[PDB]
Amino acid sequence: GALKRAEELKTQANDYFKAKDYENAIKFYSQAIELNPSNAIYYGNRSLAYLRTECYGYALGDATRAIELDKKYIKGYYRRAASNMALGKFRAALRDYETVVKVKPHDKDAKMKYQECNKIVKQKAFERAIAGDEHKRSVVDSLDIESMTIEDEYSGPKLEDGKVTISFMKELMQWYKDQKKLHRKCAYQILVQVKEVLSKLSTLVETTLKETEKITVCGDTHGQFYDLLNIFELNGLPSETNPYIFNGDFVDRGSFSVEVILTLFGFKLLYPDHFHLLRGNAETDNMNQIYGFEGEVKAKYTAQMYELFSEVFEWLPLAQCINGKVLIMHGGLFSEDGVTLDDIRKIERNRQPPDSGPMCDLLWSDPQPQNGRSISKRGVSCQFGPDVTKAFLEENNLDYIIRSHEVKAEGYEVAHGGRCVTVFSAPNYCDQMGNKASYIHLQGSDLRPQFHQFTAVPH
């Protein structure tokens, strides 16, 4: 019978297997099973040789069938449990080990392995009993509050569940002229959806800008409703039709400052691909204490709203590049010339360093016409200039930088030959400070800074 030739071939296969010539052995193993279903001890040895050759399935099936037809095949249960362990399956190996151990209690090798694997399983069991999600839960309650619908809708807004219509975003703006507010549930409904979208969106933003599209930029625009009306005089509607970059302090030093971000966040949900809203320094937590916005929100709405706005100020984009040719930035890149947005991106958008430290050194590193790097009196202790900025443009392959933080007695800045560009977009800061504002028109095919002047603001 042919099986006896396969058994002789299995004797040389064990010599060959112990000499790593596995392919010959496995051919002879196939020839043996092609006839014989029942050579249990030598199946378990193809089960072992298969385990060593990572043929998990064959061995597992061979042991299962053998144990099913032979409930006494203890070495097969031991091979099966060893294969299960190697695959990473503990509970199946335990069931097999317990079954080896009850069918033949006299083999201490099976017994010690069973109890070692039980002890290993106690760790994974304890891990499933001790663990939980590694964050404070907090703002997720905003989903619960809305899903509880404490009130649903209001005399002004008509908001949709998500992606509020452009006509309702228009409506919302035109009773910010009337100086009304959103209902708390519907303000939460947009804000949690905005948060979710911002939490998914790229960990730090780099974009190739397209050719025919025309730049609208705001530098700082410390929130005022006339400033919103006046930018709708300065340009048409952002409307997925023009790239619209809000590179500014917006949320501070003006009475209408939560209202500015409430509409602008709406527009970011509806216009995601080329609407980019970058952190001021003044959007950060402590800014709201020093210029009272923390308490101004707390009067306007209960404190949890302000906590959500402070959380969304950590979810907001930190810096970004336009076409790989201009850095759009509140301030300027931190420390030495080698830092890119590809270095900064590795740090996630759920954080703030010290007020003089790496993100804040972005947000507030000041200029100088003085060409070197330097440290500044304002409080960040950092200010950089034309030699260092040209080194960043080469290191990072850019052609110019736009900055937005610096209040002006008039308008914009062109400095050191226009390689660096300043835009400032808050004509009145408060009754301490009224002066001219600048806007820029720039186009995504051809790049040089070109300037628009903005004269006066009412109240």
Partner: peptide, 27 residues
């Protein structure tokens, strides 16, 4: 969970550690 303090917080903690020694496989 009801707002009642223990008579001896240490022996609760000893009993929790008698459990955590299982949890760490110590003894």
């Amino acid at each position: 969970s009801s707002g009642f303090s223990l008579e001896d917080p240490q022996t609760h903690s000893n009993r929790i550690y008698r459990m955590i020694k299982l949890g760490l496989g110590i003894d």
